[PDB]
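Hello everyone,

My group is preparing for a crystallization screen and wants a predicted model to guide construct design. The compound we'll soak is magnesium ion. Before spending weeks at the bench, it would help to have a computed complex in hand. I've included the protein sequence and the ligand's SMILES below. Output in structure-token form would be ideal because that's what our pipeline reads.
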Amino acid sequence: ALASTRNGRDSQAKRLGVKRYEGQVVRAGNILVRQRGTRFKPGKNVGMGRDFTLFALVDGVVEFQDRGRLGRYVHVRPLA
Amino acid sequence: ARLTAYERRKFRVRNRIKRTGRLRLSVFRSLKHIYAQIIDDEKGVTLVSASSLALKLKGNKTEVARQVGRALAEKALALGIKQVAFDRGPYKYHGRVKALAEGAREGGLEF
Amino acid sequence: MLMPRRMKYRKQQRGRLKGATKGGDYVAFGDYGLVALEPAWITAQQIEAARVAMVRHFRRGGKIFIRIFPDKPYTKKPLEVRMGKGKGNYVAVVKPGRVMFEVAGVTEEQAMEALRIAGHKLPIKTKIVRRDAYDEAQ
Amino acid sequence: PLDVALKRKYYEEVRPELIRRFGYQNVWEVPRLEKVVINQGLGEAKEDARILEKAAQELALITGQKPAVTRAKKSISNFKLRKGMPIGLRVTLRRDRMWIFLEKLLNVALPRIRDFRGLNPNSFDGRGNYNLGLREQLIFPEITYDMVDALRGMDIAVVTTAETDEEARALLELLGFPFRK
Amino acid sequence: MKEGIHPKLVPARIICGCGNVIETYSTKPEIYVEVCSKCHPFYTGQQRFVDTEGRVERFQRRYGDS
Amino acid sequence: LLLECTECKRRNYATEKNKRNTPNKLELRKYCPWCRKHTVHREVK
RNA sequence: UUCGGAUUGGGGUCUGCAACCCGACCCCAUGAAGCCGGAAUCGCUAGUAAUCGCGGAUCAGCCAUGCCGCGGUGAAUACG
RNA sequence: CGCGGGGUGGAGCAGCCCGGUAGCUCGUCGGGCUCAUAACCCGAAGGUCGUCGGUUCAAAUCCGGCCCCCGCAACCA
RNA sequence: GCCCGGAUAGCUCAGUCGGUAGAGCAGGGGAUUAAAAUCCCCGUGUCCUUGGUUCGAUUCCGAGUCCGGGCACCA
RNA sequence: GCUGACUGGGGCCUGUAGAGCACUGAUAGGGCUAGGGGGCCCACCAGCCUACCAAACCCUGUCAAACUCCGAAGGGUCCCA
RNA sequence: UCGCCUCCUAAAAGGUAACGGAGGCGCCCAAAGGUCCCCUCAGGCGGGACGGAAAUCCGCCGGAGAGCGCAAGGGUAGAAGGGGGCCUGACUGCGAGGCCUGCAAGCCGAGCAGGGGCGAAAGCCGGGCCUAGUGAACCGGUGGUCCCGUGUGGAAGGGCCA
RNA sequence: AAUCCCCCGUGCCCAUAGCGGCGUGGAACCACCCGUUCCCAUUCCGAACACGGAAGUGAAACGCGCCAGCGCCGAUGGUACUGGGCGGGCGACCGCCUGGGAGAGUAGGUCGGUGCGGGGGA
Ligand SMILES: [Mg+2]
Ligand SMILES: [Mg+2]
Ligand SMILES: [Mg+2]
Ligand SMILES: [Mg+2]
Ligand SMILES: [Mg+2]
Ligand SMILES: [Mg+2]
Ligand SMILES: [Mg+2]
Ligand SMILES: [Mg+2]
Ligand SMILES: [Mg+2]
Ligand SMILES: [Mg+2]
Ligand SMILES: [Mg+2]
Ligand SMILES: [Mg+2]
Ligand SMILES: [Mg+2]
Ligand SMILES: [Mg+2]
Ligand SMILES: [Mg+2]
Ligand SMILES: [Mg+2]
Ligand SMILES: [Mg+2]
Ligand SMILES: [Mg+2]
Ligand SMILES: [Mg+2]
Ligand SMILES: [Mg+2]
Ligand SMILES: [Mg+2]
Ligand SMILES: [Mg+2]
Ligand SMILES: [Mg+2]
Ligand SMILES: [Mg+2]
Ligand SMILES: [Mg+2]
Ligand SMILES: [Mg+2]
Ligand SMILES: [Mg+2]
Ligand SMILES: [Mg+2]
Ligand SMILES: [Mg+2]
Ligand SMILES: [Mg+2]
Ligand SMILES: [Mg+2]
Ligand SMILES: [Mg+2]
Ligand SMILES: [Mg+2]
Ligand SMILES: [Mg+2]
Ligand SMILES: [Mg+2]
Ligand SMILES: [Mg+2]
Ligand SMILES: [Mg+2]
Ligand SMILES: [Mg+2]
Ligand SMILES: [Mg+2]
Ligand SMILES: [Mg+2]
Ligand SMILES: [Mg+2]
Ligand SMILES: [Mg+2]
Ligand SMILES: [Mg+2]
Ligand SMILES: [Mg+2]
Ligand SMILES: [Mg+2]
Ligand SMILES: [Mg+2]
Ligand SMILES: [Mg+2]
Ligand SMILES: [Mg+2]
Ligand SMILES: [Mg+2]
Ligand SMILES: [Mg+2]
Ligand SMILES: [Mg+2]
Ligand SMILES: [Mg+2]
Ligand SMILES: [Mg+2]
Ligand SMILES: [Mg+2]
Ligand SMILES: [Mg+2]
Ligand SMILES: [Mg+2]
Ligand SMILES: [Mg+2]
Ligand SMILES: [Mg+2]
Ligand SMILES: [Mg+2]
Ligand SMILES: [Mg+2]
Ligand SMILES: [Mg+2]
Ligand SMILES: [Mg+2]
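Reply:
Good plan to model first. Here are the tokens for the complex, ready for your pipeline.
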């Protein structure tokens, strides 16, 4: 309807974002980024799960890469 | 019309290959010749080379191709290289490109 | 009256009157301006009060520019208390140093005595201005 | 067959006239003629998908190629049209088979058109290709007139490497295209 | 061309008010064309037979002798 | 329409979804059993 | 439709001072509606009804298919 | 303000639910029967569906705003 | 989940000792001196679907599709 | 049992303040122009004039929580002190 | 009005209230799924019989404004969009390590083994571009199975898997 | 063999590489090109993809230059805002300190740069 109130909803926050930043040490499996579209693409030693979710493939440290119109990139550098 | 069919399928198959992260056995083929170049990315670097040009052979372009494959294996295997992935570029795996690849076993392989 | 057609959203949050006019402000169309010394929500009905005072002031003659527009919807409840928002019931946000109005094609002594009338219809203090080098070229 | 009288007429006496007229540094710059695309739009057979394969049988006969079918891009209400259905036949012919078809068109078909004070010369498309369209299909030699169930015409696209209309006109004129001037 | 599904397209002969068009190379050899215009009856090779415009012409002609 | 598909023997199966009036047929597709390995698997009950 | 000839294009003929409005007629072309007519409704009992042609008055000519007449052929049906 | 129903040929009412198709009675128009009118019979015309927006391939139909209509409610104070 | 009853041309439907299909208001045609009724004629309706039973199946066996009443159940 | 709040250095994350108008919308003045509002000459396709309607487009000039070509201060986190 | 998803409020990490502003879900798809191969939009201008603002065709221009089953957002043609061939990984046995988080839940997940699919391969494949399409436990139904079986053998009834 | 130059691949920066105009290149690379027998192709078409070729052409495409009309990049100075610290105003809001400091805009910039490998000249 109009007045009484037709509004009132909202959904739960999804706690989305970057979970490991540059030069943080990770282990195989650690998810690195939680995100909706392809907003960061998977890099070197980095997986992407069906919900667009990026994880470390290998132990290591995380480096961020901005490739211009190729988008932004997350890799894991071994010395695992 | 921007960015042609050629350059799309071009990128398409490279990108897929480039993920698995092997050494890349790339294949250019002109209407005259057929060349093949084995690359390691992340160093952005060529390792082994083979051409119908620098080998100066001719007649039956396919048969010429099988040769520049064996030519590559032989030179390549000599540096330790055995496993790689076949780039196949913007070419149907068929004919001349098929032939170089099936001439590139006997030597480093899985094609 | 003055009012948009077509809005994207019917109601919209109040927000602040913070700052300086941020553009508008340099006297682009006319010989004389009326500039805002204070912030305020100037109402579609105050604007039209001022516009008419000026045309009445000269001859149906002259030329008048306005140059602020009431695109911000102004809600009010009835004598109720609290359940939802709404309703109704339009303003233009106006910070200091903005040119509203701004006449042309009239004698200075006309424009200035009309712009003086005009600002008596406004909720804020005002300043009459002329035109300059300072109003540049563009 | 690689011979085909019109093909020849183009090479011996159409090309040189064109070089003589516009004048051309390069053999390639002189207009070639690629791609006659013939297209029957038919809403006519829409709910009937049977009527169609007759029309494609007709088009084959005069072209020497079976056409492929075009299917509705988007869905439109006002004349039926689910976004699925076949709208019509379209055949591409080039390279010889093109020629052998244009010959027949110039010397037999258009002559057989009732009235015909000639091909309209405003149909050049400004970048130098030309289009026209026919009301009935029986103006062709391969059509026996007792094989017409119902009339269906078509659209013909003459595509040409000529950068402009003027040149494109000249090419087609010289090939024997009768024009209403 | 895909082999199957196709009209033969074999050399032919063909006819008109004129002689033959040797060109042919068509489906269905030996065809008879009713009339063409080129072959120069009926428009091109402009005959202008039967010719029109007489009707402004006429009203002035038998007219002022009478 | 909840879906239930046996194979032929041992009657244990594996479980599906088609809520719908097509596919309406015997609704059969190749699957791995817990039984031996990769048999024919037809729908049922 | 070799049915039917309305309409229209062109070409002429005659009367008449004169055929645009408004004439009749001949020829070429054009060939429309029309496949026995809703509710309803008219005439006719015998040489009648149907059907076929012919003359006259008026009148330069004629919109006559009208009217007033002439004969040719020639039914059906009346319990009541 | 609040909840519920409504707005369609001139009149009264269906169709909305379940997307594609707008029907019924009366009136109106033309013919008929009658000396004439009514009754009666044979034919016809007539609505964009309050409105503005949206959804869809398609909106009287589904959705939102606004405008009128009718009803219910407005209690302890 | 049940059992059963109802599903027929255009509508209602009425009809199983199985070998053939049917009737009224409709529709149309025809008569009826004013306009109903009443007379006389014609409509695959593949009689609720599929496989099965023998010559034969609206009507007989295996599953069903749909509908009702009165029962059931419902963590 | 030195890892703590706080602090220094370094990296990475972000889309607020401010501002902007490239998107989505709104929007003042002018220009140029589709469709027409039809003044009408038509009542043949025509068909011109518009101090009214008008898309887009150019020029000037603005506005926005659910607009962003941009974008600080700060904030978060990890390493080393 | 009550659970779930999208946006804003939300003060550039996460999170954050109000009978604050706006919308959506309670499904759907045996192809709308897996893979290999191919293809690239919408719009505008010009040309073209019936074709009209739009059916189909031809030309040029058009980096994405289209499409991605449905709301919104984010994403996306160097495909996630459109067509086709083979196919059923919308597998079974598990699961390093994490996101989230009061619990219980929710979520992503490489990798190994069995047997497969598509591919020359590299490889991908444990449904769908993603984020809604859902409901602890207790009672019971139905299919299987080894487990228990009240002196013993069976049966009754349970358990366990679905 | 290094060095340089041209081509061909193939990376990288991610428009200062772009659009448009102009000019230039075929020996060699490359392309278009010749053909459709064969492998393989087209919901029709050897267009594309594919093969067997080598007569011609640098027209298209591609490469290399040069033009600042567009596009893209873009200071310095000054403001806005602001961490932290203080004031003022009934209010809306405003000012000072110290530290950080845009966006628009102005000046300019720009018709790319570069790694590995080949082929050819040096
Ligand atoms: Mg949220
Ligand atoms: Mg400004
Ligand atoms: Mg106020
Ligand atoms: Mg109270
Ligand atoms: Mg004042
Ligand atoms: Mg033209
Ligand atoms: Mg051209
Ligand atoms: Mg007259
Ligand atoms: Mg007859
Ligand atoms: Mg009659
Ligand atoms: Mg007389
Ligand atoms: Mg007479
Ligand atoms: Mg009447
Ligand atoms: Mg009466
Ligand atoms: Mg409404
Ligand atoms: Mg609509
Ligand atoms: Mg009480
Ligand atoms: Mg009381
Ligand atoms: Mg009181
Ligand atoms: Mg009656
Ligand atoms: Mg310490
Ligand atoms: Mg830091
Ligand atoms: Mg702001
Ligand atoms: Mg804007
Ligand atoms: Mg904002
Ligand atoms: Mg910047
Ligand atoms: Mg320390
Ligand atoms: Mg947003
Ligand atoms: Mg936040
Ligand atoms: Mg914050
Ligand atoms: Mg935050
Ligand atoms: Mg709701
Ligand atoms: Mg288009
Ligand atoms: Mg067009
Ligand atoms: Mg999009
Ligand atoms: Mg969306
Ligand atoms: Mg969407
Ligand atoms: Mg989106
Ligand atoms: Mg597929
Ligand atoms: Mg198989
Ligand atoms: Mg775990
Ligand atoms: Mg937990
Ligand atoms: Mg896995
Ligand atoms: Mg395995
Ligand atoms: Mg295999
Ligand atoms: Mg309990
Ligand atoms: Mg239990
Ligand atoms: Mg036992
Ligand atoms: Mg016992
Ligand atoms: Mg016992
Ligand atoms: Mg048991
Ligand atoms: Mg940029
Ligand atoms: Mg050469
Ligand atoms: Mg040369
Ligand atoms: Mg060139
Ligand atoms: Mg700048
Ligand atoms: Mg600065
Ligand atoms: Mg401060
Ligand atoms: Mg700056
Ligand atoms: Mg440049
Ligand atoms: Mg380079
Ligand atoms: Mg070199």
